[PDB]
């Protein structure tokens, strides 16, 4: 756990943000602006609405209220489907990177420095 966090998480994060902001500037032009009614509008901007929904859709707390009230609702959904596929590729190459060149030598280096 100390080997992944101190060494191998910043590999995952720095490629995640460029995939976050890559779809972040794309989805922000699709989102219709919050001041349509201003009765329950407490948003933080057009760019801020697009990025915060990509956090919630990754951790599993996403909704569909913005996808319905959008400019192009079908085109807004296909970038969300593509975002899941790119996220799964990021999660699947983290396992291959933690199996670097031998699955035993990872268990060796955690056993030597434990003692």
Which residues of the chain form contacts with a copy of itself (CB under 8 A)? 1, 4-5, 9, 15, 52, 55-64, 77, 80-81, 84-85, 88-96, 98-104, 106-108
Q: Would you count residue 103 as binding Na ion (CB under 5 A)?
A: yes
Among 6, 60, 102, 113, binds Na ion (CB under 5 A): 60
Q: Which of a copy of itself, Na ion, ligand POV, none does residue 46 bind (CB under 5 to 8 Å by kind)?
A: ligand POV
Which stretch, 3-11, 48-56, 78-86, 102-110, contacts Na ion (CB under 5 A)? 102-110
Other Cβ atoms less than 10 A from the Cβ of 115: the count is 4
Nearest to 79 by CA among 33, 32, 22: 22
Which stretch, 21-29, 37-45, 47-55, 99-107, contacts Na ion (CB under 5 A)? 99-107
Q: Would you count residue 96 as binding Na ion (CB under 5 A)?
A: no
Nearest to 53 by CA among 76, 86, 72, 85: 76
SS3 assignment, position 102: coil
| Minimum distance from residue 12 beta carbon to ligand POV (Å) | 9
Other Cβ atoms less than 10 A from the Cβ of 15: the count is 15
| Alpha helix ranges (H) inside 28-112 | 46-59, 65-68, 73-98, 104-112
Binding residues for Na(+): 60
The torsion angles phi and psi of 107, rounded to 5 degrees, stand at -75, -20
Write out the residues near Na ion by the rule CB under 5 A. Answer: 60, 103
């Amino acid at each position: 756990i100390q080997k992944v966090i101190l060494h191998d998480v910043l590999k995952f994060l720095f490629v995640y943000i460029v995939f976050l902001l890559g779809f972040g500037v794309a989805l922000a032009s699709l989102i219709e602006k919050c001041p349509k009614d201003n009765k329950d509008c407490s948003s933080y901007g057009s760019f801020s609405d697009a990025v915060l929904e990509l956090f919630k859709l990754t951790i599993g707390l996403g909704d569909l209220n913005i996808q319905q009230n959008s400019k192009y609702p079908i085109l807004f959904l296909f970038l969300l489907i593509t975002y899941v596929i790119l996220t799964f590729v990021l999660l699947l190459n983290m396992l291959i990177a933690l199996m670097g060149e031998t699955v035993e030598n990872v268990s060796k280096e955690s056993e030597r420095i434990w003692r």
